[PDB]
């Protein structure tokens, strides 16, 4: 089997991407944030505290003839950005772009934190990291990809995120028309439950490539590119007027600037992030100070190749017995 679904930016800044997902019988379509940095599939639902719902589409398990309460199971998750959610668990039929899993754990939110309530465009998350990170207790549950894997033509999924435009998630096949050149594969450690790999270095604009190992995660659920302070300083040093602002919480730059590109290494290959991908617009409405798309990972504890990086590439998440990651230009 295979599946293919279009993924769409939630806003003009590509703050996140949503992908339609069919849940239950008859289908209830929710727009979920596919997140390779976590491993829970959770949804706004008929069980979510009413005051915490503000425009999201909800899953109502009582209206699904295939929904079954998973007895005694609960979940609770806290993300790197301080947001959180929790609730109970159903199993139900879940389909993505034509690919169907029966008995998928669908984690129904009873509580969500303010940032979720405040974002009417995201109806939940679909985790695509390794199932070892799944928070369901007392019996850990598998991700959608883990459940689908054996049935797929090839045990892979691909992320092809657009810049200010739609893109595609494919399951079970590699669309050879979706990228240029070849796909360079690189080793993955699953030891922390993430798609964790080591970049071979970086360049800023037309500058010389610096060979240096950067361990990080491929995370479609993080908006920006978080890298070591030395790397980030080298980037923003090339932008007149850019500075790290403690009050704003990162590097800001004059909105009038033209940003340089940023290149990262995948083996001997190179992925070039155009400067425009690094502009996240005014810090507040009407401001001429703009937020940077490359930020320090210091105090996160891990480097994160988030959407800013991933959207410059066609990315293969290879779930073979020994997982690997593949990157191609596009």
Curated annotation (Swiss-Prot):
Residues 17-328 form the Peptidase A1 domain. It catalyses: Hydrolysis of proteins with specificity similar to that of pepsin A, prefers hydrophobic residues at P1 and P1', but does not cleave 14-Ala-|-Leu-15 in the B chain of insulin or Z-Glu-Tyr. Clots milk. GO terms for molecular function: aspartic-type endopeptidase activity. Disulfide bonds join 255-290. The active site is at 35, 199. GO terms for biological process: proteolysis. The keyword Cytoplasm does not apply. Keywords: Aspartyl protease, Disulfide bond, Hydrolase, Protease, Signal, Zymogen. It is an enzyme of class 3 (hydrolase). Its EC number is 3.4.23.22. Belongs to the peptidase A1 family. This is Endothiapepsin. It comes from Cryphonectria parasitica. The lineage of its organism: Eukaryota, Fungi, Dikarya, Ascomycota, Pezizomycotina. The chain holds residues 90 to 419 of 419 of the full protein.
């Amino acid at each position: 089997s295979t599946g293919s679904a279009t993924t769409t930016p939630i806003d003009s800044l590509d703050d996140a991407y949503i992908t339609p997902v069919q849940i239950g019988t008859p289908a209830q379509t929710l727009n979920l944030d596919f997140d390779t940095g976590s491993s829970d599939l959770w949804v706004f639902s008929s069980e979510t505290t009413a005051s915490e719902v503000d425009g999201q589409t909800i899953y109502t398990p009582s209206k699904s003839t295939t929904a079954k309460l998973l007895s005694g199971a609960t979940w609770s998750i806290s993300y790197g950005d301080g947001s959180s959610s929790s609730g109970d668990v159903y199993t139900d039929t879940v389909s993505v772009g034509g690919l169907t899993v029966t008995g998928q754990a669908v984690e129904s939110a009873k509580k969500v934190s303010s940032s979720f309530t405040e974002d009417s465009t995201i109806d939940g998350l679909l985790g695509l990291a390794f199932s070892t990170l799944n928070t369901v207790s007392p019996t850990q549950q598998k991700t959608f990809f883990d459940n689908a894997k054996a049935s797929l033509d090839s045990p892979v999924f691909t992320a092809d995120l657009g810049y200010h435009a739609p893109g595609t998630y494919n399951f079970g096949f590699i669309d050879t028309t979706a990228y240029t050149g070849s796909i360079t594969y690189t080793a993955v450690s699953t030891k922390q439950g993430f798609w964790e790999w080591t970049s071979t270095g970086y360049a800023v604009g037309s500058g010389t490539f610096k060979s240096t190992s950067i361990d990080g995660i491929a995370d479609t659920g993080t908006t920006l590119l978080y890298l070591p302070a030395t790397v980030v300083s080298a980037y923003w040093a090339q932008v007149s007027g850019a500075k790290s602002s403690s009050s704003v919480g990162g590097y800001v730059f004059p909105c009038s600037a033209t940003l340089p590109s940023f290149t990262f290494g995948v083996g001997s290959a190179r992925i070039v992030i155009p400067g425009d991908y690094i502009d996240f617009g005014p810090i507040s409405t009407g401001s001429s100070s703009c937020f940077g798309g490359i930020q320090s990972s210091a105090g996160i504890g891990i480097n994160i190749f988030g959407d800013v990086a991933l959207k410059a590439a066609f990315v293969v998440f290879n779930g073979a017995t020994t997982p690997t990651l593949g990157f191609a230009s596009k």
